[PDB]
Design a binder for this molecule. Structure first.
Ligand SMILES: CCCC(CCC)[C@H](N)P(=O)(O)O
Ligand SMILES: [Co+2]
Ligand SMILES: [Co+2]
Length: 304
């Protein structure tokens, strides 16, 4: 395998971290290939759940806890810390909140969160590499509590980064907030990609195509599929009570992606950097509630 960039995996990994049995587990947790029967049963559906009041409550809760966990990870980012060390802390932080780390054994993913450095677009596996000055690192958290998943990510700066890293991460965050700001009943899920690409392109960046935002609630990934690029053919119209993510991945170079032989780690084919931000959103009568919002600050961690 020819690596697209300078990054390499740093194995071996620490043995699988156990989750105490008193933590409620999603269905895939103990499937041998980490497949989710509830997802399998609904695969290919276009129908979007309308959440009940109790659902909304469970989504608010798990998304607030997920935010707390991301905030733990953010506080650890600095040169020298390994992504594996972040994942350990995250795993403990989930358990400490009576939650299961959704990524863990999701389709056999080996860790409890995704850590994506520089040219990793998404789904990077926490490993023994210490973060280096000038890196950008995204940590993507999902927790599972009482039958509900809550999903968010942020890109972070490791020490001083260069002007291109600043611009990439700022622009990515802007893309996200501009898409969120359009969300309300009656808007077509496909329009979000128009808004994202218009902003990325204005700033000299491309938009990943192979990964999309998604519905989330009792299932980790379900309807709707939400592409982040212009003129896509997503199906569906936003309605009050819909819950989904928007998670644009934006790149310095070209948009094309490939996967490492680990089956997960998605990288730019050109080996240039990519950044991402993600929130879980609930469509309300008037607009949208950002379930995974930071509560103790108006801003993401990279600004502050
Ligand atoms: C280990 C998996 C975790 C992953 C989804 C996997 C398909 C992310 N939270 P995503 O939905 O890409 O934001
Ligand atoms: Co995520
Ligand atoms: Co997601």
């Amino acid at each position: 395998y020819r690596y697209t960039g300078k990054l390499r995996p740093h194995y071996p990994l620490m043995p699988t971290r156990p989750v105490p049995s008193y933590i409620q587990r999603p269905d895939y947790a103990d499937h041998p290939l980490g497949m989710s029967e509830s997802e399998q049963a609904l695969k290919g559906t276009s129908q979007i759940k309308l959440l009940s009041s109790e659902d909304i409550e469970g989504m608010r809760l798990v998304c607030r806890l997920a935010r707390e966990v991301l905030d733990v990870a953010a506080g650890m980012i600095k040169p020298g810390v390994t992504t594996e060390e972040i994942d350990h802390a995250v795993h403990l932080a989930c358990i400490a909140r009576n939650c299961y780390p959704s990524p863990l054994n999701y389709y056999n993913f080996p860790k409890s969160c995704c850590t994506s450095v520089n040219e990793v677009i998404c789904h990077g596996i926490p490993d023994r590499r210490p973060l280096q000055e000038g890196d950008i690192v995204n940590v993507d958290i999902t927790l599972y509590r009482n039958g509900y998943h809550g999903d968010l990510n942020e890109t972070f700066f490791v020490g001083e980064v260069d002007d291109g890293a600043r611009k990439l991460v700022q622009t990515t965050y802007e893309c996200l907030m501009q898409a969120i700001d359009a969300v309300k009943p009656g808007v077509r899920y496909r329009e979000l990609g128009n808004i994202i690409q218009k902003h990325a392109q204005a700033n000299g960046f491309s938009v990943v195509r192979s990964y999309c935002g998604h519905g989330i609630h009792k299932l980790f990934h379900t309807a709707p599929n939400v592409p982040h690029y212009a003129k896509n053919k997503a199906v569906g119209v936003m309605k009050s009570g819909h819950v989904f993510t928007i998670e644009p991945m934006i790149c310095e170079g070209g948009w094309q992606d490939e996967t490492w032989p680990d089956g997960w780690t998605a990288v730019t084919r050109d080996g240039k950097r990519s950044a991402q931000f993600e929130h879980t959103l609930l469509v309300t009568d008037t607009g949208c509630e950002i379930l995974t919002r930071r509560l103790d600050s108006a801003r993401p961690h990279f600004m502050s």
